[PDB]
Design an enzyme around this catalytic site. Structure first.
Site, PDB file in Angstrom:
ATOM      1  CE  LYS A  39      46.020  45.450  71.156  1.00 31.47           C
ATOM      2  NZ  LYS A  39      44.356  44.525  69.927  1.00 31.47           N
ATOM      3  CG  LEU A 180      45.975  29.089  55.085  1.00 38.18           C
ATOM      4  CD1 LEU A 180      44.519  29.064  55.297  1.00 38.18           C
ATOM      5  CD2 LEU A 180      45.998  29.268  53.360  1.00 38.18           C
TER       6      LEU A 180
HETATM    7  N1  ATP Z   1      48.223  31.251  62.143  1.00 39.04           N
HETATM    8  C1  ATP Z   1      47.736  30.686  63.069  1.00 39.04           C
HETATM    9  N2  ATP Z   1      48.318  30.266  63.875  1.00 39.04           N
HETATM   10  C2  ATP Z   1      48.260  29.493  64.555  1.00 39.04           C
HETATM   11  N3  ATP Z   1      48.043  30.127  65.907  1.00 39.04           N
HETATM   12  C3  ATP Z   1      46.806  30.973  65.240  1.00 39.04           C
HETATM   13  C4  ATP Z   1      47.212  31.480  64.482  1.00 39.04           C
HETATM   14  N4  ATP Z   1      46.952  33.383  64.293  1.00 39.04           N
HETATM   15  C5  ATP Z   1      46.327  33.156  65.190  1.00 39.04           C
HETATM   16  N5  ATP Z   1      46.542  32.458  66.334  1.00 39.04           N
HETATM   17  C6  ATP Z   1      46.690  32.029  67.602  1.00 39.04           C
HETATM   18  O1  ATP Z   1      44.906  32.487  67.524  1.00 39.04           O
HETATM   19  C7  ATP Z   1      44.226  32.672  68.821  1.00 39.04           C
HETATM   20  C8  ATP Z   1      43.909  34.553  68.319  1.00 39.04           C
HETATM   21  O2  ATP Z   1      45.216  35.441  67.619  1.00 39.04           O
HETATM   22  P1  ATP Z   1      45.566  36.705  68.272  1.00 39.04           P
HETATM   23  O3  ATP Z   1      46.315  36.747  69.570  1.00 39.04           O
HETATM   24  O4  ATP Z   1      46.623  36.686  67.013  1.00 39.04           O
HETATM   25  O5  ATP Z   1      44.787  37.890  67.236  1.00 39.04           O
HETATM   26  P2  ATP Z   1      44.097  39.448  67.182  1.00 39.04           P
HETATM   27  O6  ATP Z   1      43.130  39.038  66.113  1.00 39.04           O
HETATM   28  O7  ATP Z   1      45.147  39.925  66.965  1.00 39.04           O
HETATM   29  O8  ATP Z   1      43.313  39.511  68.965  1.00 39.04           O
HETATM   30  P3  ATP Z   1      42.374  40.504  69.491  1.00 39.04           P
HETATM   31  O9  ATP Z   1      41.851  41.287  68.560  1.00 39.04           O
HETATM   32  O10 ATP Z   1      42.516  39.799  70.537  1.00 39.04           O
HETATM   33  O11 ATP Z   1      43.729  41.256  68.825  1.00 39.04           O
HETATM   34  C9  ATP Z   1      45.900  33.404  69.615  1.00 39.04           C
HETATM   35  O12 ATP Z   1      46.238  31.697  70.236  1.00 39.04           O
HETATM   36  C10 ATP Z   1      46.969  33.144  68.617  1.00 39.04           C
HETATM   37  O13 ATP Z   1      47.614  32.128  68.986  1.00 39.04           O
HETATM   38 MG    MG Z   2      45.651  41.053  69.125  1.00 33.60          MG
END
Ligand code: ATP
Ligand code: MG
Ligand code: ATP
Ligand code: MG
Lengths: 224, 224
Positions: A39, A180
């Site tokens: 990251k 999804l």
């Molecule tokens: N398939 C999924 N099922 C359940 N919860 C999910 C799923 N994908 C994402 N989440 C939840 O949604 C939130 C955001 O997901 P995540 O942190 O993966 O996104 P991100 O794109 O990495 O965000 P950022 O832009 O902050 O880096 C988290 O709390 C995560 O646990």
């Molecule tokens: Mg993230």
């Protein structure tokens, strides 16, 4: 060759980059494909008080392969502001603009010791990191393949297609995958019918991440 | 010439097309620029039970200029499904694909009787209306100028910039305007610093809708 590199971007903050990156690296490692999660740039963090950032989650997974890793080995520019990296840098660290040449070296060094290097971006393809470069520019400099994660709500068609247009306009190998979530069956009724049509008409289909771990491992590792 | 035509699209459903269209037509009418609001394609509606759709709101405003207008004069393809127009059409009205040649004639006919014809789209620039055409394609066929409304939350930079890239890649005059809602001052701290930078570096700046009624009227009416 040395290890492959896959950049993970998204249609939107919170779409699921970190969730999907962690699931893909877990799958690849279980298949014997030695995979690290990085990251390089992270905003919205306070490391003095919170050990839950993307880099911290990545570090926990990564230490299953290398106990010696620490946060500073996998994340390099970190900011408190919840903003684009460029503005967080200008406000918090005015004398240290983000150096993507340096990042490129650091990230490529991990291709000596890993079969796959997964690199989570921040913000979106067009989010600015320096005055002259956005996330896509960074990915292009890395010569990485691209996995773009989409959200699974109404609007995903437009968002996927806007990103498709930008990505197909550049020289990189990419794949758009919908994250999804559990409990969403509106997706199948509302959005999926168009995804299916689009895929009959496109040489680069939009996939569903949860259906696609094997395909996305193949994609990340294929070729030079 | 005949009346000018301005298409109103958005970064996302619910960004503020209808709010901003109504405010701009109100301003233009108060300035003596006779302006009609049209919603040619609308999804998510049930006209038998609900008189609150975009077309209904437009009709109320429009009847201040022409009591004889009815809903069918300003909105032409209407669907219950909350989806892209193409899929709603395929499911609800399989034998009547949306005819953008017909729409183009209907919309252009209002340039005989109005100084400005404002046309709200649906869904986003890349949302499909027919098998071969999206909203942007429709706007291009109309030869309209384009006003793209952006939301005012975190993510607006990426969303505005994705749309900018698509729009600058096509032959049309366009303007991106942020719909800055009441009670949002995070915008000024988080996003505005980059908008300001971008605007020093761009020949087509991103504006704030609420600051820009006069500028956007000028834009809509300028030239042929
Ligand atoms: N398939 C999924 N099922 C359940 N919860 C999910 C799923 N994908 C994402 N989440 C939840 O949604 C939130 C955001 O997901 P995540 O942190 O993966 O996104 P991100 O794109 O990495 O965000 P950022 O832009 O902050 O880096 C988290 O709390 C995560 O646990
Ligand atoms: Mg993230
Ligand atoms: N500047 C604003 N201040 C307060 N409320 C707003 C503002 N703009 C939009 N809204 C509210 O947000 C909601 C969505 O706005 P609006 O209907 O204008 O969006 P839209 O882009 O036309 O949506 P659609 O995609 O459904 O056509 C509405 O309830 C509206 O009243
Ligand atoms: Mg509307």
């Amino acid at each position: 060759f040395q290890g492959h590199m896959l950049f993970i971007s998204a249609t939107n903050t919170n779409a699921g980059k970190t969730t999907c990156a962690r699931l893909l690296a877990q799958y690849c490692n279980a298949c014997g494909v030695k995979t690290i999660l990085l990251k390089p740039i992270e905003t919205g963090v306070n490391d003095a008080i919170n050990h839950s950032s993307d880099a911290h989650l990545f570090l926990q997974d990564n230490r299953l392969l290398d106990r010696s890793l620490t946060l500073k080995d996998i994340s390099f520019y970190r900011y408190h502001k919840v903003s684009a990296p460029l503005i967080a840098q200008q406000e918090e660290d005015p004398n240290a603009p983000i150096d993507t040449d340096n990042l490129t070296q650091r990230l490529h060094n991990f291709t000596k010791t890993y079969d796959l290097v997964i690199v989570e971006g921040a913000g979106g393809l067009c989010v600015p990191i320096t005055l002259e470069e956005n996330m896509l520019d960074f990915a292009l400099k890395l010569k990485a393949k691209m996995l773009l994660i989409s959200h699974d709500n109404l609007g995903l068609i437009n968002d996927c297609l806007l990103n498709d247009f930008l990505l197909k306009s550049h020289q990189l190998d990419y794949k758009i995958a919908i994250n999804l979530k559990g409990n969403n069956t509106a997706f199948h009724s509302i959005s999926l019918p168009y995804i299916e049509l689009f895929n009959t008409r496109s040489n680069n289909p939009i996939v569903i991440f949860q259906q696609s771990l094997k395909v996305l491992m193949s994609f990340a590792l294929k070729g030079s």
